[PDB]
């Protein structure tokens, strides 16, 4: 789960298949967080109104 360890241990063409899955997981986490924040913001806006 450490980027430098992957880079400092594998040559590029096999490091790519590891970097890709790390990227997919982190993108999924960010997307979930953003969606929850949007819903929470909508509720807060209703309360402020």
């Amino acid at each position: 789960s450490v980027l430098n360890d992957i880079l400092s241990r594998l040559d590029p063409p096999e490091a790519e298949v590891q970097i890709d899955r790390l990227i997919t997981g982190r993108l999924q986490s960010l997307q979930t967080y953003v969606t929850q924040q949007l819903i929470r913001a909508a509720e807060i806006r209703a309360s402020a109104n």
Partner: protein, 49 residues
């Protein structure tokens, strides 16, 4: 690497190496025909860690 007798398959000899400097350039250069395909790490000089 350079020895006289090698143990059998069913009773394989295990050797422990520690507390020294391991230059991996000699193994790659000498007897290059010897298979040197590696798992998890890259032998392409990325073995110096």
């Amino acid at each position: 690497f350079n020895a006289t007798r090698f143990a059998s398959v069913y009773a394989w000899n295990r050797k422990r190496i520690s507390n020294c400097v391991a230059d991996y350039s000699v193994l790659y250069n000498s007897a290059s025909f010897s298979t040197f395909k590696c798992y998890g790490v890259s032998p392409t000089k990325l073995n110096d860690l």
